[PDB]
Amino acid sequence: EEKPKGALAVILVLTLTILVFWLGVYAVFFARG
Amino acid sequence: SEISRVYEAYPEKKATLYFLVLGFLALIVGSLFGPFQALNYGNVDAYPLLKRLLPFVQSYYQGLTLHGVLNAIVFTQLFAQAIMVYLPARELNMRPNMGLMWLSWWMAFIGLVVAALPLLANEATVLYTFYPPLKGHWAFYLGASVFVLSTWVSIYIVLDLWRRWKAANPGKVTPLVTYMAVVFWLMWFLASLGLVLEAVLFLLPWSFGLVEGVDPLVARTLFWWTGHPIVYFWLLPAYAIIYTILPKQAGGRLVSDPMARLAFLLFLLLSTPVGFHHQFADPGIDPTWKMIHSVLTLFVAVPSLMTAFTVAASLEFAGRLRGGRGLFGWIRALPWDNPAFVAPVLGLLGFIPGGAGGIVNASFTLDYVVHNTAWVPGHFHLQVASLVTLTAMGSLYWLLPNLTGKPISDAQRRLGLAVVWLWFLGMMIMAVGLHWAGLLNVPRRAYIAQVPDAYPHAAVPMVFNVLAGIVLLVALLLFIYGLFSVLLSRERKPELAEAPLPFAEVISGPEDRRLVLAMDRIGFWFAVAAILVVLAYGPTLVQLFGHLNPVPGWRLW
Amino acid sequence: DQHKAHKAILAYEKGWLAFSLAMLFVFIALIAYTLATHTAGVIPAGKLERVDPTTVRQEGPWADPAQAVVQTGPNQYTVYVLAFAFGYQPNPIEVPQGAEIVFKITSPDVIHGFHVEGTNINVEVLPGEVSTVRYTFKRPGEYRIICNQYCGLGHQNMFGTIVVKE
Ligand code: HAS
Ligand code: HEM
Ligand code: CUA
Ligand SMILES: [Cu+]
Numbered sequence: 001e002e003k004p005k006g007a008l009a010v011i012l013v014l015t016l017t018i019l020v021f022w023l024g025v026y027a028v029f030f031a032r033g
Numbered sequence: 034s035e036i037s038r039v040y041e042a043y044p045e046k047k048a049t050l051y052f053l054v055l056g057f058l059a060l061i062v063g064s065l066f067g068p069f070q071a072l073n074y075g076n077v078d079a080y081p082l083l084k085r086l087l088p089f090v091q092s093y094y095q096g097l098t099l100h101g102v103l104n105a106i107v108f109t110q111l112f113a114q115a116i117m118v119y120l121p122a123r124e125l126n127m128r129p130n131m132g133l134m135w136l137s138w139w140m141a142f143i144g145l146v147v148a149a150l151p152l153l154a155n156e157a158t159v160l161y162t163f164y165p166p167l168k169g170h171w172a173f174y175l176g177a178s179v180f181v182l183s184t185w186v187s188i189y190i191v192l193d194l195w196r197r198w199k200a201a202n203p204g205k206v207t208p209l210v211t212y213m214a215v216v217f218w219l220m221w222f223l224a225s226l227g228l229v230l231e232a233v234l235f236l237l238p239w240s241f242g243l244v245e246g247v248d249p250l251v252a253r254t255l256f257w258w259t260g261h262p263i264v265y266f267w268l269l270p271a272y273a274i275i276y277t278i279l280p281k282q283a284g285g286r287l288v289s290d291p292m293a294r295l296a297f298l299l300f301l302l303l304s305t306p307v308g309f310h311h312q313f314a315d316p317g318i319d320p321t322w323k324m325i326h327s328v329l330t331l332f333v334a335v336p337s338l339m340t341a342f343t344v345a346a347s348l349e350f351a352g353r354l355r356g357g358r359g360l361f362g363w364i365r366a367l368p369w370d371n372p373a374f375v376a377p378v379l380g381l382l383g384f385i386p387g388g389a390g391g392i393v394n395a396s397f398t399l400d401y402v403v404h405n406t407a408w409v410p411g412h413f414h415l416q417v418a419s420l421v422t423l424t425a426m427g428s429l430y431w432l433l434p435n436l437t438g439k440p441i442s443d444a445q446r447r448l449g450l451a452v453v454w455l456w457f458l459g460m461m462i463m464a465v466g467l468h469w470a471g472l473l474n475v476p477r478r479a480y481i482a483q484v485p486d487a488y489p490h491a492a493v494p495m496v497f498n499v500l501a502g503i504v505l506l507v508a509l510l511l512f513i514y515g516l517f518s519v520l521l522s523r524e525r526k527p528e529l530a531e532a533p534l535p536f537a538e539v540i541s542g543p544e545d546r547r548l549v550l551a552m553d554r555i556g557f558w559f560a561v562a563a564i565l566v567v568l569a570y571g572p573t574l575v576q577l578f579g580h581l582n583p584v585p586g587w588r589l590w
Numbered sequence: 591d592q593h594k595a596h597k598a599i600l601a602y603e604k605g606w607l608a609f610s611l612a613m614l615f616v617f618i619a620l621i622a623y624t625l626a627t628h629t630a631g632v633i634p635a636g637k638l639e640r641v642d643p644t645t646v647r648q649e650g651p652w653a654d655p656a657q658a659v660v661q662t663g664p665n666q667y668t669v670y671v672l673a674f675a676f677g678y679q680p681n682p683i684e685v686p687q688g689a690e691i692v693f694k695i696t697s698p699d700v701i702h703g704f705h706v707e708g709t710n711i712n713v714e715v716l717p718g719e720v721s722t723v724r725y726t727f728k729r730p731g732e733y734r735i736i737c738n739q740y741c742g743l744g745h746q747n748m749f750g751t752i753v754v755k756e
Pocket of ligand 2: 421
């Protein structure tokens with residue numbers, strides 16, 4: 001029928017998660033030199 | 034010598050019942066020490082309430098060492114051995130080579146009781162890792178090193194069914210579920226090598242007086258070779274349960290036998306060469322062999338990112354089919370009342386902060402921020418303690434009738450899914466305290482209850498773990514209470530004990546059999562494979578088997 | 591419906607699978623950028639360096655804990671450090687600010703961790719090897735060495751101390 005908008009949203013969340021996560025810990029690793 | 038015609042006409046419907054039930058026992062024991070360890074990191078010393086409640090137990094660490102082996106190694110592999118065998122069977126209908134599929138269970142057992150004895154003694158109280166130089170008992174590295182070998186039989190038995198079917202059906206591709214259990218089983222040999230290597234060529238002789246020392250750079254380089262892939266082992270079976278059984282539990286269909294076949298392909302090629310991710314903090318291994326694994330490691334993430342979409346898209350078709358409203362109406366539509374559905378979906382949920390942390394973990398240098406802190410046991414709880422665990426815990430509520438016959442009473446069901454909702458709630462919170470504590474630097478594996486002002490900036494998350502321990506405790510008891518009623522009730526309604534296995538249909542297209550037909554040269558890959566294990570661990574297991582510097586063992590407990 | 595939406599469930603798959611490799615590369619980029627600056631000073635030194643544990647608290651750099659610090663450059667100081675079952679040697683290690691510190695840790699005994707609370711200094715120490723790391727404490731304080739790798743019952747208690755002076 002179309003776009004699986006739902007699954008797009010599910011993989012949209014994993015993406016903000018897989019980022020906020022990676023991204024904050026990059027900050028933490030640079031704060032620590 | 035049987036009754037239930039059920040087993041006289043399929044007896045591996047039992048070589049599967051036991052493997053499975055040795056498995057959840059092993060869970061019950063371990064997952065006990067857990068509520069207690071939670072409270073530890075909650076900064077609360079409940080270990081004397083424990084010490085006397087099982088005075089066979091000496092140190093906090095005697096526990097973690099139980100909690101580790103039994104849960105990560107025992108319960109998981111035993112579950113890989115119920116599902117990753119018995120499924121390929123019923124999909125080909127063929128009877129697994131029932132002898133070999135029975136030297137398996139008996140093996141497992143003695144290996145388990147061999148390595149239990151010293152373990153409930155204190156003669157191997159050396160963490161799930163059994164890292165050299167701390168030495169263990171002789172009975173530890175045999176037991177364990179017997180237990181693991183069990184799976185090898187299994188590899189046969191499956192590879193066995195795989196070729197009786199290839200040939201009794203010549204030119205028809207491999208079925209989907211067997212095609213999982215094939216590349217999955219073939220992926221485990223090419224991994225296990227490592228730890229079998231380090232058992233044959235190291236732990237065993239030196240566990241037996243046959244040298245006075247182990248080099249640990251290799252004893253722990255060789256151990257991660259197995260050490261990674263293994264989790265994928267821990268994991269891929271419930272990907273299978275999730276790819277090919279959740280959809281139709283949801284009232285949907287896997288929407289691509291191809292995309293699933295590709296996952297499992299990519300898992301074979303990539304779960305074996307990534308071990309140095311474990312070794313970032315180890316020295317003696319070069320920065321580039323390091324860096325070479327960090328990217329491979331980010332690659333193996335490409336199967337799980339995909340499994341995500343395929344499953345979401347898939348829950349959703351199913352969700353709409355059953356009245357699926359607007360942008361999230363699909364969620365509210367699903368079988369939220371059936372734990373075979375809820376257990377893995379809650380699993381898959383917090384599998385989001387799961388993999389994300391994973392991708393931190395593997396991003397080479399970032400590992401220095403989190404390596405050996407609460408962060409890691411927080412990360413794996415999301416993964417094994419929870420997706421894997423709940424996917425198996427929840428796979429009782431349909432695979433258990435289908436293997437005994439006691440169906441699930443609307444008592445049991447509605448218990449089935451409180452157990453499931455606390456474990457998941459428990460795991461989330463625990464997860465938050467653990468990841469946070471770690472970010473503050475609480476080390477892991479540490480009886481921090483007993484150096485109880487050392488970690489004062491971890492106040493409020495320590496509260497989260499307290500909260501967690503209580504909740505998982507309830508949850509675990511509630512679990513015991515309820516596993517026990519469905520292999521104990523003396524109902525025996527055998528007809529749905531022959532319901533064949535709720536496999537989904539498989540939303541099939543045109544651009545299948547090109548691609549599908551590409552990933553079926555099992556062979557070409559099973560070697561593209563090897564070439565990879567070799568190219569990566571090749572260079573080091575040599576700058577290394579050449580500077581064998583072993584040192585003597587110890588026993589600081 | 592169903593065969594309209596598998597000519598759509600695979601397209602999106604690479605809408606997605608493309609993106610995911612895109613995103614995963616920005617990562618190996620950013621990972622190497624780190625591998626460019628100082629920061630990756632912390633990476634265990636890779637080229638091997640075998641030594642003996644039963645005799646290291648006997649001869650060689652590791653037996654007199656106050657010979658630990660040794661100016662090995664214009665701006666560098668080396669600290670030979672000893673993580674042993676249930677403490678570190680020296681305690682405190684004293685070292686300068688602005689100054690590149692090459693740590694070279696090792697064991698008389700079991701594997702240990704040398705985890706410098708507040709820095710990126712985090713590194714396995716195997717009885718048999720010389721875990722070599724370099725770090726530039728740009729800021730005075732006493733820091734806390736944390737053992738973060740099980741070595742039997744002493745472990746929750748195994749801490750050391752760094753003092754980088756002004
Ligand atoms: C059971 C097991 C495990 C899985 C699976 C697992 C996955 C990964 N892990 Fe891990 N791990 C590491 C990296 C990864 C990566 C990159 C993956 C990847 O496979 C992760 C990929 C995951 C994703 C890419 C997310 C996919 C999301 C999905 C698939 C959910 C979709 C949602 C749906 C479908 C539902 C929505 C539904 C609705 C109804 C709305 C690294 C380092 O790079 C370390 C060591 C760090 C250190 O320094 O010690 C590590 C440490 C561990 C340890 C500790 C070992 C020890 O004791 O020393 C364990 C036990 C463990 C387990 C497991 N791990 N891991
Ligand atoms: C309520 C249930 C559970 C709780 C509360 C729990 C909690 C914990 C905690 C707090 C630790 C940290 C130990 C430490 O670093 O001191 C740990 C260890 C660990 N857990 Fe669990 N866990 C539970 C269930 C499980 C399950 C089901 C599995 C397997 C799927 C599992 C696998 C592991 C492994 C492999 C370790 C590593 C400990 C080691 O040897 O370092 N846990 N657990
Ligand atoms: Cu030394 Cu833990
Ligand atoms: Cu791994």
